[PDB]
């Protein structure tokens, strides 16, 4: 919230022009979105889960965080020099994590120092802090971490490592069990002031506002659904 705790090391070496989106509502780049959002598979095409859920150990290589079925890296401590603008973690409710030292004491140096870190280490609520985080790296790429995602079972070519609510494929793949970030379902992700910056291809998603319980406590948030 304090603007001084924002990692703000932004570097437009490629001249993609992503910095304007930090300031202005109409300057998110949804070019290339219709074709890439076609890569994403609807949940219908994945195999049917079965058996007990185990947490997945892998870090599969896609680097395409724009799909709902993207299995994220687990959250760690990342240095402020890799971050541009606010880091949002999802509890499900959106929350901003500020720049800090390795212990968690707040620092106020714009992330311009080497001690400045963003400690995103996630343990899923209700006991933990959040489910996942999203942020823009210093050269204009969306980065996301969280989970670990779930082994839901299945057999074959197609098999879902679920990072969201996947009730369709397995009855117990709830968001509390497998939620790994902003995607609440294959259809909805949490709306927050920089969703269009981080997820420009959700531009046409319609805003439903949502009420949602994670371990007793109710969460009161707007979701953008297709």
């Amino acid at each position, epitope marked *: *919230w304090h603007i001084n705790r924002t990692a703000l090391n932004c570097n437009d070496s490629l001249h993609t022009g992503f*910095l304007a989106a930090l300031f*202005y509502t*109409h300057k998110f780049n949804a070019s290339g979105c219709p074709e890439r959002m076609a890569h994403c598979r609807p949940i219908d095409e994945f195999a049917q889960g079965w058996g007990p859920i185990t947490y997945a150990e892998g870090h599969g290589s896609d680097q395409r965080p724009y799909c709902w079925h993207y299995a994220p890296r687990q959250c760690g401590t990342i240095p402020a020099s890799q971050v541009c603008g606010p880091v949002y973690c999802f509890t499900p409710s959106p929350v901003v994590v500020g720049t800090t030292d390795r212990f968690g004491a707040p620092t106020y140096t714009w992330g311009e120092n080497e001690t400045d870190v963003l400690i995103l280490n996630n343990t899923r609520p209700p006991q933990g802090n959040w489910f996942g985080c999203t942020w823009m790296n210093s050269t204009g790429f969306t980065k996301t971490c969280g989970g670990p995602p779930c082994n839901i079972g299945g057999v074959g070519n197609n098999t879902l490592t679920c990072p969201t609510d996947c009730f369709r494929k397995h009855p117990e793949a709830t968001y509390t069990k497998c939620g790994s970030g902003p995607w609440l379902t294959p259809r909805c992700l949490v709306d927050y002031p920089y969703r269009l910056w981080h997820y420009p291809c959700t*531009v046409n998603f319609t805003i439903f506002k949502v009420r949602m319980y994670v371990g007793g406590v109710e969460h009161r948030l707007n979701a953008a659904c297709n």
Partner: antibody, heavy 125, light 113 residues
Framework: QVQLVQSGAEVKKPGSSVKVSCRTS??????LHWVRQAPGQGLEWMGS????????TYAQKFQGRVTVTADRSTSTAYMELRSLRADDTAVYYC????????????????????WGPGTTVTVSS | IVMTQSPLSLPVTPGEPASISCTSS???????????LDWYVQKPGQSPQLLIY???IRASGVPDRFSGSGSGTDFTLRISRVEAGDVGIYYC??????????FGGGTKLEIKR
């Protein structure tokens, strides 16, 4: 009620460099701009900078002979045009848009609503 | 994006209305639902000055007798009771490509005698 106070006129000779200054007074800005106006000709954007980030953008016509920089502590931004030519005599306007990043979300465009008084730069031998 | 303007010179009898057109090489209408075209006036001797932003909103100190309309690629600035004060050059400018601005060649408002 941000004001933009600019450095005074400059009589330069062909080949040399000028560094025009612009100081935001009484608030913050999303982005400074440099727009110039050759005698009798129109308005030409040259470059701009987000003073928060300190990252500038340049028009192609001046790429390589202009640099825009923004000193944070003094709330002063500079524009330096080098290899000056008689073609470069003009009034040099810095102009802003925005009040600065709210730190919570993007803002809506509200125009280039504040212009400085201009800097007259003469290039002649 | 290229901003061309018409007319270049506009002689206007005082109190009579005035109108000046701007066209954009590409549509200035955005996902958000706003047209990102501004209108500026430079009165002789003075700095450029903002008149109208986002197609239709008029800036601080700007009277109701200035109105901007238009959508996509065709826009118009209309001035209803032209006065000797209004003389100057009127510029449109697209803001779809900020930080980069691109201005039109300008339209000269001129009192007819």
């Amino acid at each position: 009620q941000v004001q933009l106070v600019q450095s005074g006129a400059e009589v330069k000779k062909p080949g040399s460099s000028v560094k025009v200054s612009c100081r935001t007074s009484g608030g913050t800005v999303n982005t400074l701009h440099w727009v110039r106006q050759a005698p009798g000709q129109g308005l030409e954007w040259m470059g701009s900078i987000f003073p928060l980030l300190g990252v500038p953008t340049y028009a192609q016509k001046f790429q390589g002979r202009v640099t825009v920089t923004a000193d944070r502590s003094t709330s002063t931004a500079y524009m330096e045009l080098r290899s000056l030519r008689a073609d470069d005599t003009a009034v040099y306007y810095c102009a802003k848009d925005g009040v600065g990043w709210s730190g919570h979300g993007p803002s809506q465009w509200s125009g280039v609503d504040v212009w400085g008084p201009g800097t007259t730069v003469t290039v002649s031998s | 994006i290229v901003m061309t303007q018409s007319p270049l010179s506009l002689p206007v009898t005082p109190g009579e209305p005035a109108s000046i057109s701007c066209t954009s090489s590409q549509s200035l209408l955005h996902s958000t639902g706003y047209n990102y075209l501004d209108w500026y006036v430079q009165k002789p001797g003075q700095s450029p000055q903002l008149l109208i932003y986002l197609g239709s909103i008029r800036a601080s100190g700007v009277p109701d007798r200035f109105s901007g309309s238009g959508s996509g690629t065709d826009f118009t600035l209309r001035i209803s009771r032209v006065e000797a004060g209004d003389v100057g050059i009127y510029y449109c400018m697209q803001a779809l490509e900020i930080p980069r601005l691109t201005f039109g060649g300008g339209t000269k408002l001129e009192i007819k005698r």
